[PDB]
Write a protein that binds this ligand. Sequence first.
Ligand SMILES: [K+]
Ligand SMILES: [K+]
Lengths: 228, 228
Amino acid sequence: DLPAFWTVIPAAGVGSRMRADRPKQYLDLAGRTVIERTLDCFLEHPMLRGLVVCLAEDDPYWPGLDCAASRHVQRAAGGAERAGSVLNGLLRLLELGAQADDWVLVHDAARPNLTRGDLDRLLEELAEDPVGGLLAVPARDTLKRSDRDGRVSETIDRSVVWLAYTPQMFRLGALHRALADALVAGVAITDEASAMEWAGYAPKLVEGRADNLKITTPEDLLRLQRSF
Amino acid sequence: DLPAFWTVIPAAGVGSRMRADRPKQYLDLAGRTVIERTLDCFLEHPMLRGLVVCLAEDDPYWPGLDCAASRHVQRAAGGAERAGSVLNGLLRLLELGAQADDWVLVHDAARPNLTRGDLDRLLEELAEDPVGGLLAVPARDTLKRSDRDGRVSETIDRSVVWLAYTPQMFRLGALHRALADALVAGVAITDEASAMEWAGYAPKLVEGRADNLKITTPEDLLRLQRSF
Ligand SMILES: [K+]
Ligand SMILES: [K+]
């Protein structure tokens, strides 16, 4: 029995202007936008309590998508960076009736190839975890550490090294506290796990598929064009 | 003035049989095989002394390629693993007149998108280096170290972490000694740098392009289909 969960998709920091080199979340992926496909990975999950997309209030692409006119997609205002956008997302979840002990999944807007199997794996492996955790994949490339002069100082043992993916799954109140405090503290937050780790907690790694990739170059798009 | 150099392409470990899921080096990349495109990255370099491809003696795909009937492409027998194939490559270079102090570049058969700019950068930055070195790219993904129970123990500082690419450039005699000794010693050799590092030496990292990617899934092929 998978746990109930909320989803937050931080998708803000889009200009007010359309640009010829579009934001990655609005690139075409086999006939639909990246972000539309990302939302498809969650919207029909039977345990989804609600999904919030964090958007610039003047985002010019969003109002043209059918997910902008969906009762199943709620909206929160973007922040100054990902953490503030996620924080606004959590406040929105509380308006929708979320409780402090509810699971929240935060997922990259530009990871449209999340499979139901990986989603369910994350939910089931963390449902009783003390902290939560994240999808991650084993590092397969050879990893070298550089010394001060740009020479190899060691080859890192990559059998203990994992690439951090999303979703990342944490309880609402705990994540809110960690993100808010880390911002005040001046921490260089990357993902939600980085805030939880700064707060002292050790997230659990859950192995996912390597092809749950993030679109960071319009060229990454090519890798996924046959995935749907 | 770029240094003179030999090239070794380890390309062995191909079965005697053709297979429906071809060896990656014989996949089609925009109308030519991967390995043909890889060879194109070296063959017309004015400082190339000679190029050796290490192949299974019964490789069924190679004899159908025009590079199998080229005076500019020499051949060496594959070994039991990459290091032994490279060692056979070095012996072939010596037959072609290579000297122990000549630079040798070893490059992955399935990295067909090496640019002349990266090749020249490697050659010029290492021409006077005491050891040699390798192309490499900064790690961009968030890297987590796992503890014994699969929880995050730390987020690795990735600003000192590099992904090892090829070519890797070392002097012939030194590389021969390192590879041969590392095999006898039972070292888990990955690339040439791993053998040189086992022998004590610190290769120099030379920054290359991230899209000099290795084709490891027929899906990686999609990323490069518009690169030529
Ligand atoms: K955001
Ligand atoms: K080989």
